[PDB]
């Protein structure tokens, strides 16, 4: 694996920080990672889970 | 001669005795297209005008 | 809205060159995921003129 930064907490980059429906729950909280994970390789794994992979429901 | 005045000639405005020397060459078709491509000198009359 | 996030619809690139004087072909795939008994049906692909007809809505 490899580990994301949330604010102080960490989680595996394929996994969500918060679920279900990450952005649809809390836009101004979903800001927190997308502030600063821009330099990290895990950004497009985190983005898929948070915003695109399977329209926040089932499987790709 | 091709591409100049008199590239096609005709003894009268009603004769069938056409002489022509347009240097027409047929070329190989391409890419599985059905068409006929060719090269000839453009009308020496259209140029002369 | 019922099928987004249940389903993936996708296609394969047919030809990128500015040709096909050969007969044209296109290939599509659909995935259904997390199946329940009530998803049982017959499924059809169908051709749609919507984009060609000025980006109108479809008729098949």
What one-character-per-residue DSSP string does C19-53 give?
A: ---SPP--EEEEEE-S--GGG----------TTTT
Q: Please report where in the chains the tokens 């836009």 appear, as a residue.
A: A27
* Coarse DSSP helix, strand, coil percentages of chain B, rounded to the nearest 5 percent: 10, 20, 70
Q: Are C11 and C28 in contact (CB under 8 A)?
A: yes
Q: Does C10 reach chain A within 8 Å, measured CB to CB? A: no
Stretch 1-60 of chain A: residues touching chain C, C-beta under 8 Å: 54-60
Tell me, in Å, the resolution of the deposited structure.
Answer: 3.5
Q: Output the CA–CA distances (angstroms, integers) from residue C23 to B14, C1, C45, C50, in the order listed.
A: 48, 35, 20, 22
Q: Output the CA–CA distances (angstroms, integers) from residue C2 to A28, A51, C7, in the order listed.
A: 27, 18, 10
Q: Are A49 and A7 in contact (CB under 8 A)?
A: no
Q: Are A14 and A49 in contact (CB under 8 A)?
A: yes
Q: Does C19 reach chain B within 8 Å, measured CB to CB? A: yes
| Pairwise CA distance, residues B2 & B22, whole Å | 5
Q: Are B7 and B20 in contact (CB under 8 A)?
A: yes
Do C and B share at least 3 CB pairs under 8 Å? yes
Question: Which chains would you list as touching B if contact means 3+ CB atom pairs under 8 Å?
Answer: C
Please state at what angle helix A43-51 crosses helix A27-34, rounded to 10 degrees: 170
User: The tokens of A4 are what?
Assistant: 């994301």
Query: What are φ and ψ of residue A11, in 5° steps?
Result: -150, 155
Q: Does C33 reach chain A within 8 Å, measured CB to CB? A: yes
Q: Does C4 reach chain A within 8 Å, measured CB to CB? A: yes
């Amino acid at each position: 694996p490899v580990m994301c930064l949330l604010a102080n907490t960490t989680f595996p980059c394929s996994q969500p920080p918060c679920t279900p429906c990450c952005y649809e729950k809390e836009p101004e909280e979903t800001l927190r990672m997308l502030e600063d994970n821009v330099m990290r390789p895990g950004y497009y794994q985190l983005l898929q889970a948070s915003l695109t992979c399977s329209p926040h429901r089932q499987r790709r | 001669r091709p591409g100049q005045f008199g590239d096609i000639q005709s003894r009268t405005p009603e004769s069938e005795d056409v002489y022509a020397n347009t240097q027409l060459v047929l070329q190989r078709p391409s890419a599985g297209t059905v068409h006929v491509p060719y090269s000839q000198a453009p009308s020496g009359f259209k140029y002369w005008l | 809205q019922k099928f987004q996030g249940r389903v993936t619809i996708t296609a394969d690139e047919s030809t990128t060159t500015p040709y096909t004087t050969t007969p044209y072909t296109s290939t599509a795939y659909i995935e259904l995921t997390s199946l329940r008994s009530e998803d049982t049906a017959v499924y059809y692909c169908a051709r749609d003129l919507g984009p060609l007809t000025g980006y109108s809505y479809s008729y098949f």
